[PDB]
């Protein structure tokens, strides 16, 4: 999980979840990485899969 190529204006919608440091399950890498950007780099990856 590298979010360097983010943000992206749109994400595909397949489900392959990641667990954020905010305890939120992100539905895919694309969603997760746009959140990272939106948080200005404060959100991180806790672990793979659902929280």
């Amino acid at each position: 999980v590298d979010c360097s190529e983010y943000p992206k204006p749109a994400c595909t919608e397949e489900y392959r979840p990641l667990c954020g440091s905010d305890n939120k399950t992100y539905g895919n890498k694309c969603n997760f990485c746009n959140a990272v950007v939106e948080s200005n780099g404060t959100l991180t990856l806790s672990h793979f899969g659902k929280c």
């Binding site: 749109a10 919608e13 489900y15």
Partner: protein, 185 residues
Amino acid sequence: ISGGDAIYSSTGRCSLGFNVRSGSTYYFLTAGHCTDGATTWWANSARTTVLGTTSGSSFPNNDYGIVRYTNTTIPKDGTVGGQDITSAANATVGMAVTRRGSTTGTHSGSVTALNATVNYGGGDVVYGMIRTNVCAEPGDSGGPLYSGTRAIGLTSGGSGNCSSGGTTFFQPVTEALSAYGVSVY
């Protein structure tokens, strides 16, 4: 199993778009990004109920794939949830449409633009897309976009979410039907 239901591959979960057929052979359409690199498809997370195997996949550029049914007993309804689908049609600006997907269920809105290009990154660009004001979330990929009893499109991707509102792009279903020589029923 009908349009909008969950489907699982070895990698993740998508939504079944539409059940289609050609002669006596049954398949289902879903998103190409979901069929890319998937072989076998199952109806549950436990992977115990087999659906079939990928027969074709077109992504990026387009965003559609088809799976041939190997499961002989599962019911293959020509509906979306309980909604009957009797034909396919082309999207038009201002058309009232509905999407159904395995994560968010059923949501409605309208077509705001045609022939849009969506760039998902690293060379994954899709062209010819239908834009709408319908939301969608991870898991919803490949579910149906319909209008009444008319099949219109397959969920591809977008931005925003169902809580706060969003924009979703769909692959025109007509193009997929024609590519594979199949039809809705």
